[PDB]
Amino acid sequence: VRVLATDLAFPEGPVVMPDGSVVLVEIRAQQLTRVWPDGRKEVVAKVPGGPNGAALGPDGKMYICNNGGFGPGAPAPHEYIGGSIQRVDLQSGEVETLFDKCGEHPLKGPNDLVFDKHGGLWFTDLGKRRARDMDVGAAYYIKPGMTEITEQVFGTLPLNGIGLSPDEATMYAAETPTGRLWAFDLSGPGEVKPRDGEKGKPICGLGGYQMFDSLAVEASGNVCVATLVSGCISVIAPDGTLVEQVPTGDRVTTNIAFGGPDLKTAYITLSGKGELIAMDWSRPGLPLNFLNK
């Protein structure tokens, strides 16, 4: 295990660039940061609110889930500025807001996102916590071209990690408080399959007191989910079998991304310790669209 950076203000949304650098978000610092291979930290852009997850899109620009702000805890009314999907230019540092609502519903707490091979964009909504109530979770899909958002999953508990199977016929969403990974068969890109209260299958539910954060998929189809409280990566097979749990040393392990040679290096955000770490992985990661393939 290598420590690539420290003193990160709740790092998240690691994107491992081909040049070896990592572009990630710092939710508390409200910025998009680039960790060079030597370790130098450079601020790509300030992203007010709560930049929560990142993914490289077809235009070489960085797409961002902005949760609107944390307090992490429930934000006060005046530090929450509304959720959104944003785009940051890695050359100019310019920030564009693409979407601040689905239909007429303001986006609440966009969390993480993944592109399909057609440029469609899945993202999760964790929702916001308030004083005496909380939003429900959801999963949305932005149609190819970044044209319009559709609400594909709604009414679960807060959703966090999201990914696609290698063949992209299954979408996975992690439900944070329950430690459950949900699999959604797709009839086609961006459309949950007809037939499945619940709209999917809970293929794995961890026992005890464990919660899920973000995730990354392996070329094997295994889904690697950052696991809160127990502080590990839970590797879950497509059938729901818990294959292993890889300790990381931080109760608040939040995300994982694959890079390096053969995509066999796991870049992991230890958000309790404020660190970005690199960890040799036993198997290769699934190439992400527009980033790795």
Residues classed as catalytic: 213
| Residue 257 makes contact with Na ion by CB under 5 A | yes
CB of 122 to Na ion, least distance (A): 12
What is the Cα–Cα distance from 251 to 272, expressed in whole angstroms? 7
What is the distance, to the nearest Å, from the Cα of residue 84 to the centroid of all Cα atoms in its chain?
14
Query: Cβ closer to Ca ion: 12 or 218?
Result: 12
Known binding residue 191? Answer is no
CB of 254 to Ca ion, least distance (A): 5
Question: Quick one: which segment of 41-49, 166-174, 249-257, 275-283 binds Na ion (CB under 5 A)?
Answer: 249-257
CB of 256 to Na ion, least distance (A): 5
Question: Quick one: which segment of 74-82, 84-92, 115-123, 250-258 binds Na ion (CB under 5 A)?
Answer: 250-258
The residue nearest Ca ion at its CB is 214
Question: Can you give the length of the chain in residues?
Answer: 293
Question: Quick one: which segment of 91-99, 152-160, 222-230, 255-263 binds Na ion (CB under 5 A)?
Answer: 255-263
Q: Is the sign of the CA dihedral 273, 279, 281, 287 positive or negative? A: positive
What is the Cα–Cα distance from 17 to 56, expressed in whole angstroms? 9
Question: Quick one: which segment of 40-48, 184-192, 212-220, 227-235 binds Na ion (CB under 5 A)?
Answer: 212-220
Q: From start to end of 47-169, where are the E strands?
A: 51-56, 62-66, 84-88, 95-99, 101-102, 105-106, 110-115, 121-125, 137-142, 149-156, 159-164
Known binding residue 213? Answer is yes
What is the Cα–Cα distance from 248 to 259, expressed in whole angstroms? 18
What is the Cα–Cα distance from 82 to 102, expressed in whole angstroms? 12
The answer for residues whose C-beta is within 8 angstroms of residue 197's C-beta and 6 or more apart is: none
SS3 letters across 20-45: CCEEEEECCCCEEEEECCCCCEEEEE
Query: Cβ closer to Na ion: 75 or 231?
Result: 231
| Residue 95 makes contact with Na ion by CB under 5 A | no
Positions in the binding site for Ca ion (CB under 5 A):
111-112, 160, 213-214
Which of Na ion, Ca ion, none binds 257 (CB below 5-8 Å, type-dependent)? Na ion
Which of Ca ion, Na ion, none binds 216 (CB below 5-8 Å, type-dependent)? Na ion
What is the Cα–Cα distance from 174 to 99, expressed in whole angstroms? 23
What is the Cα–Cα distance from 104 to 119, expressed in whole angstroms? 23
Known binding residue 12? Answer is yes
CB of 23 to Ca ion, least distance (A): 16
| Residue 192 makes contact with Na ion by CB under 5 A | no
Query: Cβ closer to Ca ion: 194 or 266?
Result: 266
**Binding residue ranges:** 12, 111, 160, 213-214
Residues that bind Na ion (CB under 5 A): 216, 255, 257
